[PDB]
Symmetry: D2
Subunit: 283 residues, 4 copies
């Protein structure tokens, strides 16, 4: 599987969206799993889930690696509402366009916020819910905020540079030997190719600050079986939010990976893939 | 499989132990997994792991459900050293007697302390390490101590009664509908059959208080791949000790079950069995 | 100062309350501090704040030890709304009746919930806010719920007895040598004198469960300078809620007493009195 | 009071120290309080405690603002042992030279480690112990390490620059409006005046990593009355270590300031001064 061979576009119409272009990468043909990426400059579906798409397809799923609005090859947008909800509407739009009745959702940081909002707004359209360090769930009981990683994320948005990108990636990853030239250059290319997404993200954040993403009060509404994952060493979203989700969602479990930042799906790909595939098959 | 059909005895000789009788229940014939029980009155290997022995044997393991010294059908003993270490010596004694070179260990509360001490003392004799709410790892950062469940455990030791047993089991289990007459009567029988174990446990606790069990300072020595499980609703051993283990053991991961007390292996048997079997096969 | 010499009654009219009798104990004549008690059977203003009223009066305050509705010598009531709000309305009613423009509030457990609701509903009528382990602020990130102490509180409500009262007091207090015959008999007398309050509390709890008390979402509205106290060893309200308040209230500080249960004002009276008096004078 | 008018030097001889020059600033003449500074480049006694020395002297104490070895105007040194212990020996040396029988200690970060080691090694020479976010107490249960601030501290040590100093100070302080030209230029001057301290600190850290500072196992030995302070928003030393100290020291209390980094004594000087003075007078 390659980015090019799996690349697709679909125009969506849902709520505020009118013929809005969504890019995604699709492989496989079984039960649908939509994987949703984080919010840093240059993020996208393929790069976030590169180590996961193959094994999930091998397991029998149809994997859709979705670019959220205002990221990668999806249309540019300035959002005046919290991103989780707007992104969730885009997932619904994509599902309607493709005739997908129910999807399992996997979401990391901003994508975990998206997945939470989707489960709240469209409970009849979600199967299982996999939450990898979801962002925007209010204050931490231990971590000063904004967290170290989020400061760097905003610095890169405002002053994009190759060196600051490298600094951000060093904070994202526990094992900094995963930062090869290929992956650094690749993310840099995503930033260079669409400078307007960076501007727009900052304008959006002014209109709808991170506090607006906090759906904590509604977590008791979630009926989907939920699998929460965290990196022990996550410097972007605080580990105690894994406990917040565990206490407030009805049917949840929490798995914490040691020696791991924001991307367990990268740093611990084999264990991540096995755990999540087992959850989807058997929970 | 039944308790009777799997029941075995072996005399051990290791350090202080001289022809000391150990009871265990054994089934299967593949790689050995020794499962180690908790410290409440009437605890034993069979009752603690009744929902687990079958699936593990089906998966290809040889399962040994060990009665620790001073519990169930093993010999009575008064211990003047911390129980984790003494119990670990007994595991070594059993392994030597049975010609088992290496075992995977699964240990709950007192059995998790045992398994930790075994990994520290005999690193060349352990495979993988599965720790289910291990006891005696020092103070909690949040939970007043002694914890609610441990108070009840000591009350039952001192004043054994059917009603206090029921009270203890109600605190052990999140879902109190698991407390059938069969299981209540069965544990009561274990207490009634060996009153001297209760006396002896209390004398032992005076000679070696719970603070003596704390091996926190040595956790960095553990080389075994480690899988830590906790119940979210454990009223016996504090949830933040799961984090303590995760931070201090080199290769660990933490899984927390919602709606679960001290016995995930009972309340969430199917998920527990799948996770642990997958860990043993693939981690 | 004695209970008898300070005892007063006032009829209140506020919202649902119509000529509702409120008992309180008053001493001193300077700036008003209203102290609000907990929710266990037999609770009341005098017994909760016996070690505090003298020093606060000596410092120049007028102290009002208020009996909340459905406790001690105040009128019996069945509440169908969360107790914090109903109690806060009663404080307002008392203040209006006595021509008190602004009061400092001190509140313990249920009284801390009361004080929070008062600050939210009547911001122009509160001075400073002192919160001693406020109850009902949602789930803990660490403590299974209902907490050990709250189970005992409900047991005593349902099956009042001298022995269960003693058990509850043993859990309330870190230092169990504070439980003299005088204080045990005194609380027992409060329970015996008004059995209907016990019945009514249980009916109220059915109509408005503890989750209904959770005002977490509104904490950002509080403008009052806030001093949060906790006992390290509190088995009734979880220590991490002290952190929740600290993160969510604008101008707060947190003081945690070691070797202390729910009643710092009893177990650490001198330090408590000095700290709170200094806060009222100088913060 | 000024730095110049209070400046003194004393040669010490204790253990490894032979005619080792210690700089300190002294004012007042009552009971002695020795205040011990943090470990960042350019740290020293005067700058760390500038807002505190006056009020403490006004309260009747003799204040000694000590420069630890390898900082500010004290002699340069490469340490091969953990800094807390070496620094504590220097405090003892200073006390012996000046005929001070007992001192109260106030210590921030590295100075809190110093104060802990002093209380452990020389219990008959300490009065009360005030610990402001002490450093080196092992892993956090929540914070990835090295913490954000400590990374910056090491960056400035290795690559000193005015801009990196400003970045470090922005992370130290919750309220960044406290960073005036005066204070920025002043700290820069301390760095410029003694470049060898920076080199030496880095060599020392190689010989004795932060894990070597962890005295957690010995905290139960401390008999001194202890007052632990933390900033809620401390990005250098993790807030859960305040709880670790509270659980493991016999007679401790914990005060957490909101909207506060590593330096409560700066950001909340008036409240800090009142609390600590009250503790010294009355606890
Ligand atoms: O959601 C995201 O942040 C996302 O696109 C994931 C990107 C992974 C990534 O850029 C990466 C870079 C270097 C090494 C490993 C991974
Ligand atoms: O180690 C132990 O505590 C142990 O022997 C486990 C016993 C399980 C148990 O007594 C039980 C009782 C009722 C329902 C489910 C389980
Ligand atoms: O709000 C309350 O729970 C309250 O009325 C306080 C009562 C204190 C109390 O009953 C007590 C009993 C024994 C020893 C010390 C104190
Ligand atoms: O121990 C230390 O880090 C110390 O010397 C304290 C210095 C305070 C400081 O540099 C500061 C700078 C700007 C604003 C306020 C304070």
């Amino acid at each position: 599987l390659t980015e090019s061979s799996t690349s697709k576009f679909v125009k969506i119409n849902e709520k505020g969206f009118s013929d809005f272009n969504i890019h995604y990468n699709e492989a496989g043909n079984g039960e649908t799993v939509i994987m949703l990426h984080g919010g840093g400059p240059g993020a996208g579906g393929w790069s976030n889930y590169y180590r996961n798409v193959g094994p999930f397809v091998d397991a029998g799923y149809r994997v859709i690696l979705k670019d959220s609005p205002g990221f990668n090859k999806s249309d540019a947008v300035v959002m005046d509402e919290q991103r989780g909800l707007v992104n969730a509407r885009a997932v619904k739009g994509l599902m309607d366009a493709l005739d997908i009745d129910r999807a399992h959702l996997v979401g990391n940081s901003m994508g975990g916020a998206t997945a939470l909002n989707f489960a709240l707004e469209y409970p009849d359209r979600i199967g299982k819910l996999i939450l990898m360090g979801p962002g925007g769930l209010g204050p931490s009981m231990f971590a000063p905020m904004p967290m170290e990683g989020i400061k760097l994320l905003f610095k890169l948005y405002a002053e994009p540079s190759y060196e600051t990108l490298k600094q951000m990636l060093q904070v994202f990853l526990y094992d900094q030997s995963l930062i090869t030239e290929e992956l650094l250059q690749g993310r840099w290319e995503a930033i260079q190719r669409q400078p307007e997404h960076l501007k727009n993200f900052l304008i959006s954040a002014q209109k709808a600050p991170l506090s607006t993403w906090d759906v904590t009060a509604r977590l008791g509404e979630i009926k989907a079986k939920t699998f929460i994952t965290w990196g022990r060493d996550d410097r972007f979203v605080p580990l105690d939010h894994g406990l917040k989700l565990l206490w407030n969602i009805d049917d949840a479990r929490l798995h914490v990976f040691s020696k791991c930042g924001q991307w367990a799906q990268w740093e611990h790909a084999d264990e991540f893939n096995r755990l999540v595939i087992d959850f989807l098959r058997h929970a």
